[PDB]
Amino acid sequence: RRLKKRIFAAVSEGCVEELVELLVELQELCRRRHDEDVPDFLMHKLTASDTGATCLMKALLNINPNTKEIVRILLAFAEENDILGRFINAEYTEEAYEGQTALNIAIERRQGDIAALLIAAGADVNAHAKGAFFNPKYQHEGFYFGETPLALAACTNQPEIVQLLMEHEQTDITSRDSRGNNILHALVTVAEDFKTQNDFVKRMYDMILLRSGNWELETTRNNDGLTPLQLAAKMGKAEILKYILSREIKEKRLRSLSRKFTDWAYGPVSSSLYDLTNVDTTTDNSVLEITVYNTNIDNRHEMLTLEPLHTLLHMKWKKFAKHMFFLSFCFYFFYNITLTLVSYYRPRGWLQLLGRMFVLIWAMCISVKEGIAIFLLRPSDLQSILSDAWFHFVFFIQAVLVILSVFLYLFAYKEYLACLVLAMALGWANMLYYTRGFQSMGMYSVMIQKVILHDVLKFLFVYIVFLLGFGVALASLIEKCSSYGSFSDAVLELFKLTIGLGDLNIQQNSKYPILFLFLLITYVILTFVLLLNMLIALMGETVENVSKESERIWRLQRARTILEFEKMLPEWLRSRFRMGELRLCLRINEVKWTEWKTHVSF
């Protein structure tokens, strides 16, 4: 009741003589045997009852210029009463830091010598700090480091303790923690995608993999089924991905770990074989399909520009995707030409039935294809971000409008013309999707979507309240017997007056003509001059901001087209795999006239 808090206050600040006198006094209080329990009474007088923290963690959490010898005499006292086997490896009891033993706090607080002192004293290294704070839901709620002391020494940039732990006998390196991660997935989750100056994590990954010297750390999957390569492609870290995909290590006994084998080099020309184990579309979930089909990252073009992704997409294009894209565009052009010629020569016999049937067949095909492609619209993050969720909707709406027009035409209903001309107008406005094949037209097909979604929806969501306010404030003072008779004619007159049409004549059948004229002049100064040109200043800002970022959007849209047309193929006709076994080992060759010349000029 009194010695426990006394020794807990004693261990904190570092009064050594008070500490050793209270430990020998605790030994005398232990000497009078109450014959209840040998270890539980010692734990009750040594560990706190609320948190679970022992005197060792309290010594380590509160470092001071006399912090080593208090741990040494405390371990000597633990060594004295035969308690050290269940004392130096004690964990928390609460479910917050549940598992955080003394070795983790020793490693985290940059105390390497105390860490080696505990590991030489018989500390456990396979401990798992599996508390909920250690594996939180997001990145901002807790410290995720893989809950092992080896990964904690690796992520906090202390390579001394990493070398000190890998040379130990018991420290299993491929130990998978609660999420499934080994040390390499934890190193990937800590790393930073932007090229910062001293990035320790690439060096740590390098030396840990070379110190292990086995393929096993590189290919174990976590609970989501992702290797470190697929995980670094998932999270969007371009530097670790660029290191892993092109890893050239030259000496013998570390050569099966390499992934790029340079075959021959001469000046700037170099031919090299890359490895394509998990970077293809052979398997169901790979680096190409991950780095193209993401939405949760921003540097997708920073990842799609490095080999063997760039040459893989070029070979995949010029082998079989260019002809499939131009063939799809030709079929959609003939479908829209046939729909236009049918809907223009409407009967106000035997020349239309051929001409109606191809339209109906291709409409049923397009509707069921988009029905499948929106049935797989499960993640609902593709809807949030601009990447090609819209065109599935518009193609499906045009197909169902065509088939609804045909089924209303074959019956006695004469409202088929509305559905048919909406189908034809939508079908000719959908041809801008096929302007992603060129380079100078992708910047013109993405601008429409960025400007409609960013600016014009905002300006219309403000302009509707001025339109409604002045519409009822003008229509309600017109005497019933000029043009402003109803609400829904005054709203049309104000819309005509906004876009430069319409008559701003004086004489409407009012009883207050000066008030009517003042409201009309105020509306024209608010929306013809102030609101409209402010919208055009905003649209200029959006178009300027997107036309300096057009080529990234075009490359990403082309890559998504590649992988969609590649998934469209059957299992046969995928006889276009890359290269025979060396492993797949795609052979590429490139010239680097900029790096060779600055490498030589020094």
Ligand X SMILES: CCCCCCCC/C=C\CCCCCCCC(=O)O[C@H](COC(=O)CCCCCCCCCCCCCCC)COP(=O)(O)OCCN
Binding residues for Na(+): 500
Sheet containing strand 260-266, strands side by side: 260-266, 269-274, 587-591
Residue 418 sits in the site that holds ligand X (CB under 6 A): no
Q: What 3-state class would DSSP assign to 374?
A: helix
Distance of closest approach, residue 580 Cβ to ligand X, in angstroms: 47
CA 172 to chain centroid? 31
Stretch that binds ligand X, among 149-157, 284-292, 337-345, 406-414 (CB under 6 A): 337-345
Q: Pick between residue 45 and residue 109 the one whose CB is nearest to a second copy.
A: 109
Give me the sign of the Cα torsion angle 362, 364, 370, 376. Answer: negative
Q: Pick between residue 38 and residue 377 the one whose CB is nearest to a second copy.
A: 377
Distance of closest approach, residue 551 Cβ to a second copy, in angstroms: 8
Distance of closest approach, residue 311 Cβ to ligand X, in angstroms: 37
Per CB under 8 A, contacts with a second copy among 334-393 are 340, 343-344, 346, 348, 387-388
Distance of closest approach, residue 489 Cβ to ligand X, in angstroms: 5
**What single-letter amino acid sits at 407?**
F
In Å, what is the CA distance from 200 to each residue of 140, 191, 262, 421?
21, 9, 26, 62
Number of Cβ within 10 Å of residue 426's Cβ equals: 17
One residue of 327, 330, 448, 472 binding ligand X per CB under 6 A: 472
Per CB under 6 A, contacts with ligand X among 492-511 are 492, 495
Q: Tell me the sheet residues that pair with 587.
A: 273
Enumerate residues 6+ apart whose C-beta is below 8 A from 86: 39, 43
Enumerate residues 6+ apart whose C-beta is below 8 A from 30: 41, 42, 45, 81
Q: Which DSSP letter does residue 478 get?
A: B
Q: Supply the Cα-derived Rg of the chain in whole angstroms.
A: 36
Distance of closest approach, residue 344 Cβ to ligand X, in angstroms: 5
Q: Pick between residue 124 and residue 307 the one whose CB is nearest to a second copy.
A: 307
Residue 193 sits in the site that holds a second copy (CB under 8 A): no
Distance of closest approach, residue 486 Cβ to ligand X, in angstroms: 4
Q: Which does 268 bind (CB under 5 to 8 A by kind): a second copy, ligand X, none?
A: a second copy
Per CB under 8 A, contacts with a second copy among 420-439 are 421-422, 424-425, 427-429, 431-432
Q: Pick between residue 221 and residue 578 the one whose CB is nearest to a second copy.
A: 578
Residue 528 sits in the site that holds a second copy (CB under 8 A): no
One residue of 340, 476, 482, 547 binding ligand X per CB under 6 A: 340
Q: Helix 532-547 and helix 442-451: axis angle, to 10°?
A: 140
- Measured CA to CA, the distance from residue 280 to residue 585 in angstroms comes to 11
Q: Pick between residue 505 and residue 589 the one whose CB is nearest to a second copy.
A: 589
Residue 486 sits in the site that holds ligand X (CB under 6 A): yes
Q: Which DSSP letter does residue 527 get?
A: I
Per CB under 8 A, contacts with a second copy among 464-493 are 465-466, 468-470, 472-477, 479-480, 487
Q: Which two tokens stand for residue 434?
A: 């096929």
CA atoms within 13 A on the CB side of 149: 32
Residue 429 sits in the site that holds ligand X (CB under 6 A): no
Q: Pick between residue 305 and residue 449 the one whose CB is nearest to a second copy.
A: 305
Residue 304 sits in the site that holds a second copy (CB under 8 A): yes
Distance of closest approach, residue 591 Cβ to ligand X, in angstroms: 43
Residue 425 sits in the site that holds ligand X (CB under 6 A): no
Q: Which does 82 bind (CB under 5 to 8 A by kind): a second copy, ligand X, none?
A: none
- For residues 82-106, one letter each, b for 16 or more C-beta atoms within 10 angstroms of the residue's C-beta and e for the rest, the string is ebbeebbbbbbeeeebbbbbbbbbb
Enumerate residues 6+ apart whose C-beta is below 8 A from 9: none
Q: Kind of pairing, strands 587-591 and 269-274?
A: antiparallel
Q: How far apart are the first and last CA of the chain?
A: 74
Residue 491 sits in the site that holds ligand X (CB under 6 A): yes
